[PDB]
Amino acid sequence: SQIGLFSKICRVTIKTLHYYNKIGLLVPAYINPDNGYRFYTSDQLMKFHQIASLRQLGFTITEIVTLTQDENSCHIIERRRLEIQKQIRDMADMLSRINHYLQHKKKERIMLYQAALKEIPECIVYSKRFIVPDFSSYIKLIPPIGQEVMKANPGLTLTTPAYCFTLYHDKEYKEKNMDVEFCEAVNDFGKNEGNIIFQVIPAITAVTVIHKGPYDSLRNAYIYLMQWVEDNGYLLTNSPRESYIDGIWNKQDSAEWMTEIQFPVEKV
DNA sequence: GCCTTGACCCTCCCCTAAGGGGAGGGTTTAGATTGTGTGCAGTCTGACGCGGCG
DNA sequence: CGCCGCGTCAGACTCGTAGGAATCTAAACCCTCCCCTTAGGGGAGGGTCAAGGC
Numbered sequence: 001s002q003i004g005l006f007s008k009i010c011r012v013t014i015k016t017l018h019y020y021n022k023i024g025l026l027v028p029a030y031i032n033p034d035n036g037y038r039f040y041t042s043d044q045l046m047k048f049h050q051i052a053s054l055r056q057l058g059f060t061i062t063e064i065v066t067l068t069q070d071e072n073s074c075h076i077i078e079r080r081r082l083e084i085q086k087q088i089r090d091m092a093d094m095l096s097r098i099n100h101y102l103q104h105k106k107k108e109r110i111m112l113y114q115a116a117l118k119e120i121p122e123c124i125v126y127s128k129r130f131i132v133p134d135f136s137s138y139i140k141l142i143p144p145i146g147q148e149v150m151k152a153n154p155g156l157t158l159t160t161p162a163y164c165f166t167l168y169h170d171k172e173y174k175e176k177n178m179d180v181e182f183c184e185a186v187n188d189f190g191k192n193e194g195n196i197i198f199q200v201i202p203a204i205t206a207v208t209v210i211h212k213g214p215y216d217s218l219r220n221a222y223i224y225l226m227q228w229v230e231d232n233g234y235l236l237t238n239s240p241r242e243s244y245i246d247g248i249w250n251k252q253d254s255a256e257w258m259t260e261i262q263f264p265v266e267k268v
Numbered sequence: 269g270c271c272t273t274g275a276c277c278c279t280c281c282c283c284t285a286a287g288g289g290g291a292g293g294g295t296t297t298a299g300a301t302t303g304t305g306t307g308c309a310g311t312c313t314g315a316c317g318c319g320g321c322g
Numbered sequence: 323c324g325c326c327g328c329g330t331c332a333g334a335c336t337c338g339t340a341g342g343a344a345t346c347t348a349a350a351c352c353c354t355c356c357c358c359t360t361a362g363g364g365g366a367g368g369g370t371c372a373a374g375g376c
């Protein structure tokens with residue numbers, strides 16, 4: 001049986017048989033020496049059936065080679081099974097994210113706020129945890145901290161890139177009684193003089209949105225991130241962070257400012 | 269200023285999985301078939317070499 | 323060997339623009355080889371950017 005007849009018996013392409021002969025998965029029963037013509041046999045079909053049976057389970061080709069040439073490989077079927085359930089979990093996550101994306105696109109004609117899930121590494125910060133009378137007043141006590149720390153900690157170099165964020169320890173929304181905590185990432189440890197203390201913040205997987213524009217429409221992004229959290233079955237594991245990437249310090253226009261809100265979450 | 273130094277940065281080339289697509293090359297093919305197929309040309313005049321007759 | 327008619331070969335003005343020539347024609351197989359596909363990774367080779375050190 002030539003390769004054209006075998007490809008019609010097997011209902012597979014000829015190039016598939018060429019590839020399987022090249023890699024050594026399915027070798028023809030007899031190859032004509034002068035022409036090169038591959039000839040196949042029923043005993044090759046009995047093996048192509050096994051190849052197809054394994055390949056329909058999503059096994060990679062090299063896994064199929066290992067399974068059919070070397071027996072007692074029950075660890076490879078377990079690896080493929082665990083990977084299949086992991087991919088199923090990831091696929092359910094992706095499905096929820098794309099359903100949410102369509103309900104939002106069908107909600108507002110322009111999408112102002114995309115949501116991205118990113119992992120934040122561990123870091124060394126100096127932090128001051130304090131009760132703030134108003135969000136407008138929160139901005140006032142930060143530049144005092146910025147000069148005082150550089151005067152009190154000489155040669156202290158902030159990391160690059162600059163991770164300067166806020167920990168919202170409030171489990172509910174309020175305007176005037178915010179128990180907030182100002183953090184700023186630094187390269188190495190230091191002295192803990194004053195109300196400013198040093199600490200490490202654990203690496204977290206967090207869903208983040210970057211808000212461009214003034215600080216009054218941030219409630220939109222928070223409700224959106226909360227909406228994302230309720231829609232996609234995540235649970236808030238830690239306090240939300242507020243990372244100030246660009247602001248009045250690089251650019252004078254207040255509507256081009258940008259900050260990224262991070263929601264530490266786990267899928268539950 | 270001349271000279272190193274460590275960190276960055278660029279393009280370019282090759283690699284990934286499982287074949288698809290195509291180019292460019294071989295091979296045979298068993299009713300019987302058995303000799304091509306066009307023109308075209310109104311030149312003249314020298315001049316040379318040769319079959320054939322004497 | 324000597325001469326006569328026959329076969330053959332070689333020559334024949336310079337400017338612009340138009341300006342070529344146009345028919346006829348396997349198919350089904352197989353092979354190898356080369357490039358292609360994600361979304362980038364890895365490395366070689368070669369440049370470049372601020373630090374300073376004398």
Ligand code: 118
Nearest residue numbers: 139142145146162164184244245247248249
């Ligand atoms: C210590 C030192 C600098 C800043 Sb800022 C800032 C950030 C958020 C809100 C208000 C101010 C900063 C600069 C670069 C990158 C990230 C943050 C800052 C710097 C100069 C002038 C005004 C503000 C804060 C603390």
